[PDB]
């Protein structure tokens, strides 16, 4: 399990420094030793984005067991440091009474431990009428309570994201077998009328086209603003180049140069919308489970 890490870490080296980043290992070295147990059946991916997050990569490890409290173990290891902020609480609460049925953390290779991701089964997928009952949840989310109902989302939540660097959560809508997002949400004209609603940044002609071949978005909220801070639309392909998309030359690089193979595998491309313009994100899969 030890050679698992050192072959990690050298990929993980590797992938930051073809899109422009370098590796901690003062930062890394730690939470692969942390997370060594579950790593081997994980699912491993590497995710660039544009503009301001272009300065670290995101190393993700997914479909981690049940029974995992993925930042427990963050606590115990050092990896993160103990908060009486309810970002600190709410993954507990989560777990609890939502049907979680396994788990993911995210660091940045440069920045070290940042989230975790807690997944339903696509069978049976969480609700916001059961988020707006934790303690810990942002109060944004029930003040916003009729942007998911009228979009037909509110009963559909297929990822929980909590970010404790930044103090931010994800809500995830859709994806694998499960309910589907209405296809209004990814039409022109409803692309127009989520972003003007929410005081995003109105879609750009590339936009709407990548739209039409998504099936997954996702809302971002916060603790201390009562407004969604963004909304992303998710596409899930394996042949990146052919999105009807400008690739970012770090993009590019990893798409073309990754130091492992992708053979055929999907990757996972958004465009997230904030109040100022829009940003990509690339999603490059190093190890999965079939
Ligand atoms: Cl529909």
Same mark, same amino acid.
């Given at each position: 399990?030890?050679?698992?890490?050192?072959?990690?870490?050298?990929?993980?080296?590797?992938?930051?420094?073809?899109?422009?980043?370098?590796?901690?290992?003062?930062?890394?070295? #730690?939470?692969?030793?942390?997370?060594?147990?579950?790593?081997?059946?994980?699912?491993?991916?590497?995710?660039?984005?544009?503009?301001?997050?272009?300065?670290?990569?995101?190393?993700?490890?997914?479909?981690?067991?049940?029974?995992?409290?993925?930042?427990?173990?963050?606590?115990?290891?050092?990896?993160?440091?103990?908060?009486?902020?309810?970002?600190?609480?709410?993954?507990?609460?989560?777990?609890?009474?939502? #049907?979680?049925?396994?788990?993911?953390?995210?660091?940045?290779?440069?920045?070290?431990?940042?989230?975790?991701?807690?997944? #339903?089964?696509?069978?049976?997928?969480?609700?916001?009428?059961?988020?707006?009952?934790?303690?810990?949840?942002?109060?944004?989310?029930?003040?916003?309570?009729?942007?998911?109902?009228?979009?037909?989302?509110?009963?559909?939540?297929?990822?929980?994201?909590?970010?404790?660097?930044?103090?931010?959560?994800?809500?995830?809508?859709?994806?694998?077998?499960?309910?589907?997002?209405?296809?209004?949400?990814?039409?022109?004209?409803?692309?127009?009328?989520?972003?003007?609603?929410?005081?995003?940044?109105?879609?750009?002609?590339?936009?709407?086209?990548?739209?039409?071949?998504?099936?997954?978005?996702?809302?971002?909220?916060?603790?201390?603003?009562?407004?969604?801070?963004?909304?992303?639309?998710?596409?899930?392909? #394996?042949?990146?180049?052919?999105?009807?998309?400008?690739?970012?030359?770090?993009?590019?690089?990893?798409?073309?140069?990754?130091?492992?193979?992708?053979?055929?595998?999907?990757?996972?491309?958004?465009?997230?919308?904030?109040?100022?313009?829009?940003?990509?994100?690339?999603?490059?899969?190093?190890?999965?489970?079939?």
């Amino acid at each position: 399990e030890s050679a698992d890490l050192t072959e990690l870490y050298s990929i993980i080296e590797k992938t930051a420094q073809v899109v422009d980043v370098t590796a901690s290992h003062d930062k890394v070295w #730690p939470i692969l030793n942390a997370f060594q147990d579950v790593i081997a059946d994980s699912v491993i991916s590497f995710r660039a984005s544009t503009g301001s997050s272009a300065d670290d990569l995101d190393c993700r490890f997914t479909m981690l067991p049940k029974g995992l409290d993925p930042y427990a173990r963050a606590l115990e290891h050092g990896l993160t440091p103990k908060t009486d902020h309810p970002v600190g609480s709410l993954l507990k609460e989560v777990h609890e009474n939502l #049907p979680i049925t396994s788990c993911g953390v995210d660091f940045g290779v440069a920045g070290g431990f940042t989230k975790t991701w807690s997944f #339903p089964s696509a069978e049976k997928l969480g609700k916001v009428s059961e988020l707006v009952k934790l303690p810990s949840i942002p109060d944004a989310v029930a003040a916003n309570r009729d942007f998911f109902e009228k979009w037909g989302i509110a009963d559909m939540v297929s990822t929980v994201g909590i970010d404790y660097s930044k103090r931010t959560m994800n809500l995830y809508f859709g994806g694998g077998v499960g309910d589907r997002v209405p296809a209004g949400v990814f039409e022109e004209k409803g692309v127009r009328a989520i972003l003007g609603e929410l005081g995003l940044a109105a879609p750009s002609e590339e936009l709407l086209k990548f739209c039409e071949r998504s099936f997954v978005i996702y809302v971002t909220l916060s603790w201390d603003s009562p407004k969604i801070n963004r909304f992303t639309y998710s596409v899930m392909t #394996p042949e990146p180049l052919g999105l009807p998309v400008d690739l970012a030359p770090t993009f590019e690089r990893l798409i073309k140069s990754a130091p492992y193979d992708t053979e055929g595998r999907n990757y996972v491309y958004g465009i997230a919308s904030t109040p100022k313009g829009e940003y990509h994100k690339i999603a490059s899969y190093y190890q999965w489970q079939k």
